[PDB]
Paper text:
The [name].1.5 variant of [name]-[name]-2 has rapidly achieved global dominance and exhibits a high growth advantage over previous variants. Preliminary reports suggest that the success of [name].1.5 stems from mutations within its [name], causing immune evasion and enhanced receptor binding. In late 2022, a recombination occurred between Omicron sub-lineages BA.2.75 and BA.2.10.1 resulting in a new variant [name].1 and its further sub-lineage [name].1.5, the latter of which rapidly became the most dominantly sequenced lineage in the United States.
Despite the measured decrease in [name].1.5 spike–mACE2 binding affinity, we were able to solve the cryo-EM structure of the [name].1.5 spike–mACE2 complex, with the aim to provide a structural rationale for the decreased affinity. Three-dimensional reconstructions, with both one and two mACE2 molecules bound to the [name].1.5 spike protein, were resolved and our analysis continues here with the slightly higher resolution one mACE2 bound state—with direct parallels possible for the two mACE2 bound state. As expected, this assay recapitulated the previously reported enhanced mACE2 binding by BA.2 spike as compared to WT, while demonstrating substantially decreased - though not abolished - mACE2 binding by the [name].1.5 spike. In sum, our functional and structural data suggest that the loss of interactions caused by the R493Q revertant mutation lessens [name].1.5 spike–mACE2 binding affinity, yet the binding affinity is not abolished due to preserved favourable contributions from the conserved N501Y and Y505H mutations.
Author numbering:
A (entry chain A): 302 to 620, 641 to 675, 691 to 696
B (entry chain B): 14 to 23, 27 to 71, 78 to 143, 153 to 178, 187 to 249, 256 to 301
C (entry chain C): 450 to 498
The structure:
């Protein structure tokens, strides 16, 4: 500290004692109001790809783990975001699009792809941020007679724009002559039936597809992953993260009666002195961990190399140990004799070298 | 089914020291805290509106400015909520706050609002709006118009959030804007994120069954918040018991 | 021919290269070196056209 190899006799304030943080405590509100993924990925009836079902998702917690464990998935391809980071990401809106297609066309549900499904039934934009999930649905959607309730659009005048749906049943006019709204040669009804049967090849078996599209807007993002309760440890110096307010301190019991709308608490000098726990509605007195001014009492290096340490303001139980009003003095022995002051300690206590003695 | 039924008259009164709210969610005890925020100035000009329906369009839409202080001495059933937005038609988003006997429904959709919107009593919203499309927000919670009693609200639209503050202060024969301090607790911080420039009060009308609606009257006070610096007194228990407006008079300026 | 590391347990240090073609565990269930549910390859190829 003194930037010299020889130290003159005296007391030098050299360092600051600190109580190191031991554990990390993160307290967040109870997980609840989970997003209804269980009503999207487990529905009694799915929808035809032409009339694909869209559910808007907002104002809820997104627990993607239930989506992960719902079924074995033929594809869980995620475009523009990794699947794992989703829980730690918060999005403004999540759109869940549900439909049934044949297995061969699952590859078509991706950005930049072409086919009957991509051009005429469901289109994803080139810059799409989201995930595509598909799983086999033979038990739910296959009948031996043939399931004729799943339809697709085979004929359309122009390609679909991204996130567009056409429900029109208008007869597709492929020829110069007007159709007149009655089926006729060169006039074909656009919606064809997916005649699913249990004995079809894997390419043609029915597959249920849910497309999750995540969008961020200027509005505050209200769909974010789970919040970890962790656990609450009191009476020790732990790094606390309470509802995004971070710090480091002991959390003692509080006698302060907060009003119901208040969450934190502040000192006269605008320093946090209290907090309300989100998990349990209790008030805790945040008190920062102990600190002290480490002062080194030493005679000249010409005479001796013994030193004594004064922890300024620190009681002796919180760190040849003597308790002074200045702080805790370690390394000097109190003598009931009184001499003149050699090295000033404070509060009437002075130190001298004879070993190092401390006296009034 | 938009019908013009409400006529409105206006007078001017004094704000006294009404309109103070908690500027944040921080517990402060036995301190003097100076904050600069959108507050209703002390002894300011507040407009008293009387809305009368007797059994032409004479109920215009009020501006919102930087936030609105609302007060009413009426019972909880006559005034049933508010409307917020810019154009108040199907082209922009709008916020509808409707209270009833059991709960409050706050809902942000693309409402095609009527010129004179009112809830008619089952309860039907066909006289409030004709259509509501592309609805993006809904929030149902316990009501804040429950049961002589002066009800005060402060609405702010700051950085995407529709901050709503409220207080229920009983009053006697004394004028509807009383003396003393009643700090407004932060009630609902709605994450809306829409543009709000105009607002209108919603009233409830009963069918007559005999002049299709029963005659009624409602009195309410509207004041406008301004960027002002206040010095609030926090007592031992964290309640704001007193405040001084720093720009009102030299004595309060010295205090601030 | 150009691949990127989509998955890794931790972030890399400056001027560090990772060429380990081991499987990544994206879920609670161990993967045991075989791909399948919630077990994905870390290196994915770019669709350059
Ligand atoms: C008061 O408002 C609530 C909320 O809008 C009404 O309760 C809903 O009534 C509808 C009837 O269309 C039900 O489908 C909902 O399930 C109810 N929701 C809740 C949360 O209860 C209530 O009916 C209204 N009461 C009156 C008298 O108008
Ligand atoms: C999912 O579907 C199966 C099929 O019957 C049902 O048994 C199960 O309860 C469903 N789970 C949920 C969470 O809906
Ligand atoms: C949160 O969870 C705790 C512990 O289960 C419970 O006591 C409390 O009522 C819950 N709700 C709130 C709002 O704290
Ligand atoms: C309030 O405003 C009106 C017109 O805006 C004005 O005539 C009236 O004098 C004002 N009130 C006071 C107390 O000045
Ligand atoms: C609003 O509604 C119209 C028709 O109801 C629709 O064309 C438009 O895309 C909608 N916009 C949004 C943002 O939902
Ligand atoms: C809010 O609406 C008003 C009235 O139409 C308009 O003048 C103003 O520009 C709008 N603000 C924004 C940010 O769009
Ligand atoms: C504050 O709380 C205490 C303890 O409940 C109570 O006795 C006192 O009346 C309250 N008000 C004031 C102004 O101290």
């Amino acid at each position: 500290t003194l930037k010299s190899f020889t130290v003159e006799k005296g007391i030098y304030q050299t360092s600051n004692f600190r109580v190191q943080p031991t554990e990390s405590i993160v307290r967040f509100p109870n997980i609840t109001n989970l997003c209804p993924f269980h009503e999207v990925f487990n529905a009694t009836t799915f929808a035809s790809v032409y009339a694909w079902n869209r559910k808007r998702i907002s104002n809820c917690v997104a627990d993607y783990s239930v989506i992960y464990n719902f079924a074995p998935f033929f594809a869980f391809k995620c475009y523009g975001v990794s699947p794992t980071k989703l829980n730690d990401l918060c999005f403004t809106n999540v759109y869940a699009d549900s439909f049934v297609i044949r297995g061969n066309e699952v590859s078509q549900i991706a950005p930049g792809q072409t086919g009957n499904i991509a051009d005429y039934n469901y289109k994803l934009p080139d810059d799409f941020t989201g995930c595509v999930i598909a799983w086999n649905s033979n038990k739910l959607d296959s009948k031996p007679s043939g399931n004729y309730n799943y339809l697709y659009r085979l004929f359309r005048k122009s390609k679909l724009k991204p996130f567009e749906r056409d429900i029109s049943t208008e007869i597709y006019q492929a020829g110069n002559k007007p159709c007149n709204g009655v089926a006729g040669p060169n006039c074909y009804s656009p919606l064809q039936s997916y005649g699913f049967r249990p004995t079809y090849g894997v390419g043609h078996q029915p597959y249920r597809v849910v497309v999750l599209s995540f969008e961020l807007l200027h509005a505050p993002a209200t769909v974010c992953g789970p919040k970890k309760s962790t656990n609450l440890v009191k009476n020790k110096c732990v790094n606390f993260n309470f509802n995004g307010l971070t710090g480091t301190g002991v959390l003692t019991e509080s006698n302060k009666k907060f009003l119901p709308f208040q969450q934190f608490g502040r000192d006269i000098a605008d320093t946090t002195d209290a907090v309300r726990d989100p998990q349990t509605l209790e008030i805790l007195d945040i008190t920062p961990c102990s600190f002290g001014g480490v002062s080194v009492i030493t005679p000249g290096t010409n005479t001796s190399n013994q030193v004594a340490v004064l922890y300024q303001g620190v009681n002796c139980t919180e760190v040849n140990v003597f308790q002074t009003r200045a702080g805790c003095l370690i390394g000097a022995e109190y003598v009931n004799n009184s001499y003149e002051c050699d090295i000033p300690i404070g509060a009437g206590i002075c130190a001298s070298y004879q070993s190092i003695i401390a006296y009034t | 089914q938009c019908v013009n039924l409400i006529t409105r008259t206006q007078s001017y009164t004094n704000s006294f020291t009404r309109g103070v709210y908690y500027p944040d969610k921080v517990f402060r005890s036995s301190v003097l805290h100076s904050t600069q925020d959108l507050f209703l100035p002390f002894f300011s000009n507040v407009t008293w509106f009387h809305a009368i329906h007797v059994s032409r369009f004479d109920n215009p839409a009020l501006p919102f400015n930087d936030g609105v202080y609302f007060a009413s001495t009426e019972k909880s059933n006559i005034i049933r909520g508010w409307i917020f937005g810019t154009t108040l038609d199907s082209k922009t988003q709008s916020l509808l706050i409707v209270n009833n006997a059991t709960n409050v429904v706050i809902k942000v959709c693309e409402f095609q609002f009527c010129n004179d919107p009112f809830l008619d009593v089952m309860e039907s919203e066909f006289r409030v709006y004709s259509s509501a499309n592309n609805c993006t927000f809904e929030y149902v919670s316990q009501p804040f118009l429950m049961d002589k009693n002066l009800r005060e609200f402060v609405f702010k639209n700051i950085d995407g959030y529709f901050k709503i503050y409220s207080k229920h202060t009983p009053i006697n024969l004394e004028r509807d804007l009383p003396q003393g301090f009643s700090a407004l607790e932060p009630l609902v911080d709605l994450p809306i994120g829409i543009n709000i420039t105009r607002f209108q009060t919603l009233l409830a009308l009963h069918r007559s069954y005999l002049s299709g609606w029963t005659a009624g009257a409602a009195a309410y006070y509207v004041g406008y918040l301004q960027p002002r610096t206040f010095l609030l007194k926090y007592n031992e228990n964290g309640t704001i018991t007193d405040a001084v407006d720093c720009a009102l008079d030299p004595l309060s300026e010295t205090k601030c």
